[PDB]
């Protein structure tokens, strides 16, 4: 109720948004070429592990 008072806009997601942040970094990792991209792409790898773990409990080839 504070959030819908804060933001009527809101995203979908079940951890899929965390992937969507993670892939948006990876595109800008390859777009903003230079010394910055190697820490900037490494933290993009850290985000996708969490919804991977949520579907790991669901149970499949979660890496695929």
């Amino acid at each position: 109720c504070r959030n819908v008072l804060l933001d009527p806009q809101l995203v979908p997601g079940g951890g899929a948004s965390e992937m969507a942040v993670a892939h948006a970094l990876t595109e800008k990792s390859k777009a903003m070429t230079g010394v910055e991209q190697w820490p900037y792409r490494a933290v993009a790898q850290a985000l996708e592990v969490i919804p991977r773990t949520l579907i790991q409990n669901c149970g499949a080839s979660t890496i695929r």
């Binding site: 499949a60 080839s61 890496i63 695929r64």
Partner: protein
């Protein structure tokens, strides 16, 4: 293929016969007396090892 000229019946293998045996063995007791069906249960579960773990090695685990 020496065996192929020997027989007349070439069968789809790789696990196709393996679960097909274990369906008939467990569900239909051949020797419905309970002493031998104990050995049937070990026998039909022996058949599962070839399709289940090579696919599990491939990434789609044994239960799927």
């Amino acid at each position: 293929v020496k065996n192929a000229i020997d027989d007349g019946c070439v069968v789809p293998g790789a696990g196709a016969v393996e679960v097909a045996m274990a369906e008939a063995l467990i569900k239909h007791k051949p020797s419905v007396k309970g002493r031998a069906q104990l050995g049937v249960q070990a026998f039909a579960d022996a058949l599962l090892i070839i399709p289940k773990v090579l696919a599990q090695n491939s990434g789609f685990d044994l239960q799927e």
